[PDB]
């Protein structure tokens, strides 16, 4: 997780999950990539 | 959709209508209930039909759900998905000892948890555990709690995994 | 023996170009090619003799070998 005011999927091993006001980009292959907010 | 407006239910399973409680009754499991908040129950007893109670736009969110939940009750009283709960790694207890199991990492306290019905087990092994089905939700929520007492650790992948396979040797490249 | 192999052996060069087909190193005769296509006919799941001929010609052309009697 990191502080980022831009959401867009990085690889297809990021998928965009919306938990309201925080939007993560964890995927099965790579939950390495992760965001906090959005 | 083609599932929130697209519906059978044999004779072994029967239903006790309420406004968005679907109470099922049947065999091998009965008296099962799960609620929504925006579906009318239409009776049919041949897969009951669903959609908005009064007109809502969250009522097909609830219709496809209520659909599958009904169907999950059907499968539930014919035993659901949880039927195992393995764990990768050796030298760690994981047999069934009555209602309690045990688990180790070299733990200086027993690690165990009792069994309610609907998830009863017994194995002859300390690696595999053979559980029982029941209502799909119920078994799944207790199934999670089991594995949660030592989630996977991935450098060799050891750590008590779920009913499904959720391990991967997703190491940090180090030993 | 592959078609790929067999046409390089018949053309007498064992190496390819640095850029195959945009550069050629040797050439391979349709007489060789027809017969290799017959041996490799067997190894094909083809329905006819022509089928094999095209498949083996296609292997020559891409390894930087000309296809010409």
């Amino acid at each position: 997780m990191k502080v980022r005011a831009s959401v867009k999927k990085l690889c297809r091993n990021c998928k965009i999950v919306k938990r309201d006001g925080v939007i993560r980009v964890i995927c099965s292959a790579e939950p390495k990539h992760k965001q906090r907010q959005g | 959709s083609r599932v929130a407006k697209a519906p059978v239910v044999p004779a072994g399973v029967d239903v006790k209508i309420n406004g968005q409680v679907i109470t099922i009754k049947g065999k091998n499991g009965e008296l099962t209930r799960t609620l929504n908040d925006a579906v009318e129950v239409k009776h049919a007893d041949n897969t009951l039909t669903f959609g908005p109670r009064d007109g809502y736009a969250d009522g097909w969110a609830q219709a496809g759900t209520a659909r599958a939940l009904l169907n999950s009750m059907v499968i539930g009283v014919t035993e659901g998905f949880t039927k195992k709960l393995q764990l990768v790694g050796v030298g760690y207890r994981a047999a069934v000892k009555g209602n309690v199991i045990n688990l180790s990492l070299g733990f200086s306290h027993p690690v165990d948890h009792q069994l309610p019905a609907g998830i009863t087990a017994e194995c002859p092994t300390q690696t595999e555990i053979v559980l029982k089905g029941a209502d799909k939700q119920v078994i799944g929520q207790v199934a999670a709690d089991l594995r949660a007492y030592r989630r996977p650790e991935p450098y060799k992948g050891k750590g008590v995994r779920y009913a499904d396979e959720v391990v991967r040797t997703k190491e940090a490249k180090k030993k | 023996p592959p078609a790929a192999v067999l046409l390089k052996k018949a053309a007498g060069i064992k190496s390819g170009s640095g850029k195959p087909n945009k550069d050629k190193v040797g050439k391979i005769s349709r007489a060789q090619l027809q017969e290799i296509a017959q041996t490799k006919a067997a190894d094909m799941t083809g329905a006819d003799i022509e089928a094999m001929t095209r498949s083996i010609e296609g292997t020559a052309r891409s390894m930087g070998l000309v296809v010409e009697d």
């Binding site: - | 190491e171 940090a172 490249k173 180090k174 030993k175 | -």
Partner: protein, 333 residues
Amino acid sequence: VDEASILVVAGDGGNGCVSFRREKYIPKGGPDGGDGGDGGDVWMEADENLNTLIDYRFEKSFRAERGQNGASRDCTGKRGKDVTIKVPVGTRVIDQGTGETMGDMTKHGQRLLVAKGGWHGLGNTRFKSSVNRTPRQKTNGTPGDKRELLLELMLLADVGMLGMPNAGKSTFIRAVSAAKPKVADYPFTTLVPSLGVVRMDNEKSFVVADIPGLIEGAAEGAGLGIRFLKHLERCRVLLHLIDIDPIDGTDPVENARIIISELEKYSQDLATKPRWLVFNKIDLLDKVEAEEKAKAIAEALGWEDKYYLISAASGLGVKDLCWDVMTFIIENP
């Protein structure tokens, strides 16, 4: 494999006083307090493990402190600091600035200071010649430390095993070691090699490093490929596997001459230094015969680069010797 050169920066100079003395009674004073900062230097630490990848991290090098000022309530400001650098698994230190090597090691828990500071801000007193009034300053000179250091592991991690297409390096290291092999990671501008841990039977353990990714032996011509083969040849210590069994497929006498000659050809100095020969496939030998041959080849070299033994057997002072080759590799040029 890669070798690296770090740029390390320490703290830096102040920023002089913006100050006036404030009174309700008396209108405005001068500056009290002043500048701030200064900054420490570069040091080095040497370590057995790694065992947290901070070299597959890398961000783009070593940064540190800018100075201070203060003003509320008549203030100066503090100092900057020293930066210290960690590697995966030992380093031998050189500095591009000296152009040469300082300390010689890959001896762990050995630290060395490459020392400078004396960075200062521009204060009100600097301008002064006992006439000046400069109440307002907020200003800095100086840049914090700059030096290019040069680190080399001694590589692939400290020692690089360079077989031949008869090799079997990992299996033998596991036989001779009750220690596990790790996958190591290093500060490489290339892929990051396979690490194998060696027992030094002293209640310390040392690691030996083998071919990029899966092994192939450098002599075969691939390290995992030409690219890898280029990563692999770089190690300062190179190791020569033979199968000192009656079998080697390319016979042991011949093999030993060809590997030893190629290393000589490349640099005679490498043969004459603490670069090793390691006798292997003694998982097919009891090591009394192996030991003799290991020892004859070694002595016949006519210089330092004698014999290492890998793959366990006997107790002819052999455990001591295994530990000794590793010690010799550690002591470094």
